[PDB]
């Protein structure tokens, strides 16, 4: 991917969870990486009037995100990707798997799923 | 009401489901099949309830001979579409979409409406099963009722 | 038409024949789908030969299963006090039995008794 | 009619369905199997009713021995192809294609016709199941009757 | 005939099916399996009848001990291949290929031949089911018979 | 509310009817799902004619299944020992029985007995 | 804890009451999952009125199904010789019955008999 | 707690599982269905326990008539997500990921907690089945309980 | 032979099938499962017979307790691979490959051999089902026997 | 040993399977599921035996109430992996990989070890089924045992 393709600003986040005392649980999503990445869709999207995508299988990736490899970070089973735009609402992507592109260890390809895109999501701390 | 010993779907949806939950503005829609169309039955705003017949069957003696007490059993289902709402906890906290949804209040007050109606007219239904399942920001709460009656022919 | 068969209301009134104390009329709840049962003619018949019959005197009986109400002592269901029962079906019929007596108590476990009630005569109401 | 204790499907269609509902202009078609060809039996102009044998079966004893009361059972299904008609309410509103469809009138009239035929000739059928399903703007209502008889032999 | 208390498939096909319908010129073909080949068993001209064993099974006691009345049950089927013939009605009218086919005459006279044979030799069969299904210009009429007997060993 | 039916506690005390030695009270555990059964009023009735009844004297009975306790001899369950029993259900009722007598012993296998206790009177408590 | 119920060893001793000949003690094998059965109290009870009971003398009985051992003649199982039996469960219990007698023989086919044994008294061992 | 003769799943998780095993830091999550979303419920740090309703059902009579002892039965499943930890022996050896995992301790402690809760409040559950399955380095232990109760109505 | 109250499959093949039909030159092969490898067991020169264990099973009680009459049941199947041979007339006609094949002779001779073996040694088998199927020019005849015995232990 | 009335899978594998066959050098590996991984559990040299739980279930009464004799049933399986060895003759002869493998010795001595253990401690298992199946040069011999017990809680 030519270095002008990476035209999106993302925040890779790892989530921590702790039980709410009243009886719930709460997921804190904190940023660990911020850089430029290039996304591409691999599936259509069913939206629902509120943003939340209505995908059924919840394991078929919809978007593929490519960014710069980093050998010490280990993209877990619990990583999110908060992408913010300028005149469009933010989006929360949930990673589903990673690809070390051609094992050249120069770019990561993160198969991710679109959770929601609405103007009332919780940005990462 | 027609059918003195029975209650046809429309009557179910408008007399038992409607005076129940006021958050559905009377959007208790009687459909032919609950899965007859998933692309059309997902446009009505959230929340809303469908009512549709699954399959009509018998309950023992069923011969059609003018006098044999033709017994019948109509198996229908009631599907709630309720919008899940996450709890926000300033400090960067949220509750995922897979958190538990309290169907119990729903079952309770639906049963209460059914009991009041049964007391008002003497018509009783059978509960068979309750299934819940979510998708994105919607939770489907699916009751399956079954109603016995006798088909009184007309002279 | 014949609205769907089934019981709608069961009222029971206990009267202890020792202290002359009264309890009720208390409602009760059917434990299952079996229905309380009735037989009104107070005269049995017996088959003689060639169409005849010996008509003798007998009782009106009633078989009623109900869940024990957790305030009335269980003994009051096993034949320890006079009962006054009243049933009401869905098609409108209501059958009353006054000053009856539990005959032949059967064992129960504490939550659902089956009373074999015997009484002089039961009246029927025949929905209009 | 042939077979004094029985009916064949053509007789069924022309005697119990045709004298019944008149908006079908006598289009009661007997087929081999109601799902043998869906490209051809979806051409006739609506509404039309099909009648076809599902499966021939027994009702207990069936040994062929010249005297054993050979019992037989015929399972056939009657499908209504009816046209759903949306309602319009000057104000620019409409009813979706997935709205409830009053089949109860259809079952009522079909059963009344069957009862009358039985009372005339002394031949009765057994009701088994009722299934309703829509597609496009056409509703399929499939009654599955069952008929018992004893097979008369000829010397 | 061999097997005094039984009839092998060739015997069946040549003594019960053959003296029946004369429109099959004795083309009652005994096959191993009715679906053993659909590309070869569709060359014989129309009409024609196949006869083939489905599965052999028991009927209770089956141990092999020299004296235990070894009971057996052979489940075979009889498949008619009859050419459908449309009715033409000068004025540009025709009857589609999905019109009802009268299997009743077939069942009747097949049963009659079976009854006459049973009376002639004392051998009776059980009727189990009847299915029909078409394809293009051919209608398959499928009987499934079942025959009980005892296997008499030889000294 | 009608808390879910079932038995919670079972106490049993054996007193040998020869040496008058006492053991217990010991707990016990149900062998299956079934529940003990009861009949309290000691006055059976019999169906006379025309609604009347003959009120005769009879026994309070109790039928109870338990798992044999591997320190008490089996004879004490087969009816060579007076027993005093107490049961307690989840909904709060308690049924006590004094100077009982295992009557009509039934052939059992050494790990699960069904005792038919007969006693003069069984007492209740009725959930608060 | 209560180790899994089931029989472990069955010893049988035949003594012919004609020739005074002895055979055994021979082991035997259970034919199925049903267990040999026991009742030790040699006194039955009968229900009088109002808590009382008539304690009379009776037997100790035992019901034991076993596969015939192909050396002992079948007649020795159908009630034709005095038997000395000994059972041993898995939880340790062993019950002995001496000089008993097969009562009420039932038909058998030659490989599994069910002996209804009656004897004066059975002793139990009660694992420690 | 609500429903004097019953428990809701949040109460189950926070009263029977949370006071039990402490190495889950109070991470007992109630969900809609334990398999509704596997991409989200595989994120919480190990180890964590899920509780979700499998299906709502009856236990005999369930007719809604104001007095019929409406009996109910809810089937729910409790799944442990526990982390398998290999053992190393210094000499250069290891234990594979497919080695046996001691669940018996887990069932023991879970059942002790349940017994204690029952003895405190008089509410008991039925054990149905236990299934263990591994994936990567995480073992899934799924207990399937079942709870009977009677549905109390409100005037 | 070992196991005085039983037979192993090699003994079965060499004692009941081999002394039977001689046109197999003693080609009675015992296999693991008759369908474990179809590429290798289709090489031997027809006509050959396979014998293989389908499934080992119980016949009632099977608890292992040193004295409980451990009852056992091994379920195995015997398959004939026989070559179908068409018949030719002298006027250029032939019989198709799908024509009926006389298995009755085969079952007869197999059962006679089994009866003789039982009468010699007092060991009997149970017949369950018989299935025949053709492929190319080879017919597969699969007998499914079942044998009960009691498992003798050794001190 | 823990569990006085039971044996956990490690104890089974090391006390019943190990002192049996000496050709497995004690390689009786306790696994979670027998099919949890086929790429890992195929590296240990031939031969070797796996032991793993299939599913845990009940045996009648199972309520958890402190005193109800909680009955339990654990269904586990024992899979032998034995290396097949062909027999060579000095003349160009060999035995194919589909030749019959004698599982009987295996079953016999495994049952013997189980009987000795049962006699030593009073613990008995139920035999349910035996399946064999090969692949290349390996024969899988699969026993499925089932063990009853009562779960004694702790004070």
Short mmCIF file of C-alpha atoms in Angstrom, two decimals, chain B residues 13-137:
data_model
loop_
_atom_site.label_atom_id
_atom_site.label_comp_id
_atom_site.label_asym_id
_atom_site.label_seq_id
_atom_site.Cartn_x
_atom_site.Cartn_y
_atom_site.Cartn_z
CA UNK B 13 -53.31 -7.49 19.59
CA UNK B 14 -55.67 -4.61 20.23
CA UNK B 15 -57.24 -5.73 23.52
CA UNK B 16 -54.48 -7.62 25.39
CA UNK B 17 -51.24 -6.20 24.01
CA UNK B 18 -52.32 -2.61 23.45
CA UNK B 19 -53.69 -1.67 26.92
CA UNK B 20 -50.44 -3.17 28.21
CA UNK B 21 -47.13 -1.35 27.64
CA UNK B 22 -47.70 2.29 26.74
CA UNK B 23 -44.26 2.61 25.14
CA UNK B 24 -45.50 0.96 21.93
CA UNK B 25 -48.18 3.55 21.04
CA UNK B 26 -50.51 0.74 20.08
CA UNK B 27 -48.00 -0.65 17.58
CA UNK B 28 -49.17 -4.22 18.10
CA UNK B 29 -49.12 -5.31 14.46
CA UNK B 30 -50.97 -8.51 13.46
CA UNK B 31 -48.93 -10.32 10.81
CA UNK B 32 -49.47 -13.52 8.85
CA UNK B 33 -46.18 -15.16 9.75
CA UNK B 34 -43.67 -13.81 12.21
CA UNK B 35 -40.87 -14.40 9.65
CA UNK B 36 -42.92 -13.67 6.55
CA UNK B 37 -40.60 -10.72 5.91
CA UNK B 38 -37.63 -9.49 7.91
CA UNK B 39 -36.92 -6.57 5.58
CA UNK B 40 -40.37 -5.06 5.93
CA UNK B 41 -41.14 -5.91 9.54
CA UNK B 42 -38.03 -4.05 10.70
CA UNK B 43 -39.04 -0.54 9.63
CA UNK B 44 -41.59 0.29 12.33
CA UNK B 45 -39.86 2.35 14.99
CA UNK B 46 -38.63 0.81 18.22
CA UNK B 47 -40.34 -0.52 20.22
CA UNK B 48 -43.20 -2.54 18.70
CA UNK B 49 -44.79 -5.98 18.97
CA UNK B 50 -45.86 -8.44 16.28
CA UNK B 51 -48.63 -11.04 16.53
CA UNK B 52 -48.87 -13.89 14.03
CA UNK B 53 -50.12 -17.43 13.66
CA UNK B 54 -47.50 -20.17 13.58
CA UNK B 55 -49.64 -23.20 12.70
CA UNK B 56 -53.21 -24.35 13.30
CA UNK B 57 -53.71 -27.89 14.53
CA UNK B 58 -56.14 -30.15 16.39
CA UNK B 59 -56.56 -31.34 19.96
CA UNK B 60 -57.88 -34.87 19.60
CA UNK B 61 -61.22 -35.44 17.90
CA UNK B 62 -61.39 -33.48 14.67
CA UNK B 63 -63.74 -35.24 12.24
CA UNK B 64 -66.16 -33.00 10.37
CA UNK B 65 -69.57 -34.63 10.78
CA UNK B 66 -71.99 -31.94 11.95
CA UNK B 67 -71.99 -33.25 15.51
CA UNK B 68 -68.65 -34.44 16.85
CA UNK B 69 -67.35 -31.45 18.88
CA UNK B 70 -64.74 -30.37 16.36
CA UNK B 71 -61.77 -29.41 18.53
CA UNK B 72 -59.11 -27.03 17.27
CA UNK B 73 -55.84 -25.56 18.50
CA UNK B 74 -54.24 -22.40 17.12
CA UNK B 75 -50.56 -21.96 17.90
CA UNK B 76 -49.50 -18.32 17.58
CA UNK B 77 -46.55 -16.31 18.85
CA UNK B 78 -45.97 -12.81 20.20
CA UNK B 79 -42.61 -11.22 19.40
CA UNK B 80 -41.44 -8.15 21.27
CA UNK B 81 -38.99 -5.78 19.63
CA UNK B 82 -37.49 -3.70 22.43
CA UNK B 83 -34.65 -1.22 22.00
CA UNK B 84 -31.72 -2.01 24.26
CA UNK B 85 -30.32 1.02 26.07
CA UNK B 86 -26.80 0.98 27.49
CA UNK B 87 -25.96 2.53 30.86
CA UNK B 88 -23.33 5.27 30.76
CA UNK B 89 -21.08 5.88 33.76
CA UNK B 90 -19.05 9.06 33.31
CA UNK B 91 -15.45 8.06 33.74
CA UNK B 92 -15.42 6.31 30.41
CA UNK B 93 -17.69 3.44 31.44
CA UNK B 94 -20.40 1.71 29.46
CA UNK B 95 -22.41 -1.50 29.40
CA UNK B 96 -21.95 -3.72 26.33
CA UNK B 97 -24.80 -4.69 24.05
CA UNK B 98 -24.68 -8.24 25.40
CA UNK B 99 -25.69 -7.28 28.93
CA UNK B 100 -28.73 -8.94 30.44
CA UNK B 101 -32.13 -7.53 29.55
CA UNK B 102 -34.99 -7.79 32.05
CA UNK B 103 -37.73 -9.67 30.23
CA UNK B 104 -39.38 -10.47 33.56
CA UNK B 105 -41.34 -7.23 33.81
CA UNK B 106 -42.56 -7.82 30.26
CA UNK B 107 -43.78 -11.34 30.95
CA UNK B 108 -45.35 -10.24 34.22
CA UNK B 109 -47.48 -7.45 32.85
CA UNK B 110 -48.40 -9.31 29.67
CA UNK B 111 -49.63 -12.18 31.83
CA UNK B 112 -51.53 -9.67 33.96
CA UNK B 113 -53.31 -8.26 30.93
CA UNK B 114 -54.16 -11.78 29.79
CA UNK B 115 -55.53 -12.64 33.24
CA UNK B 116 -57.71 -9.54 33.36
CA UNK B 117 -59.06 -10.32 29.90
CA UNK B 118 -59.75 -13.94 30.84
CA UNK B 119 -61.63 -12.75 33.90
CA UNK B 120 -63.60 -10.31 31.78
CA UNK B 121 -64.73 -12.78 29.12
CA UNK B 122 -63.82 -16.33 30.13
CA UNK B 123 -61.11 -17.08 27.56
CA UNK B 124 -57.83 -18.71 28.59
CA UNK B 125 -54.56 -19.34 26.77
CA UNK B 126 -51.69 -21.76 27.29
CA UNK B 127 -48.10 -20.63 27.71
CA UNK B 128 -45.60 -22.87 25.90
CA UNK B 129 -42.17 -21.25 25.78
CA UNK B 130 -40.21 -18.00 26.03
CA UNK B 131 -37.14 -17.23 23.93
CA UNK B 132 -35.04 -14.08 23.82
CA UNK B 133 -32.36 -13.18 21.31
CA UNK B 134 -30.60 -9.96 20.38
CA UNK B 135 -29.13 -8.42 17.25
CA UNK B 136 -27.17 -5.19 17.30
CA UNK B 137 -29.33 -2.81 19.34
#
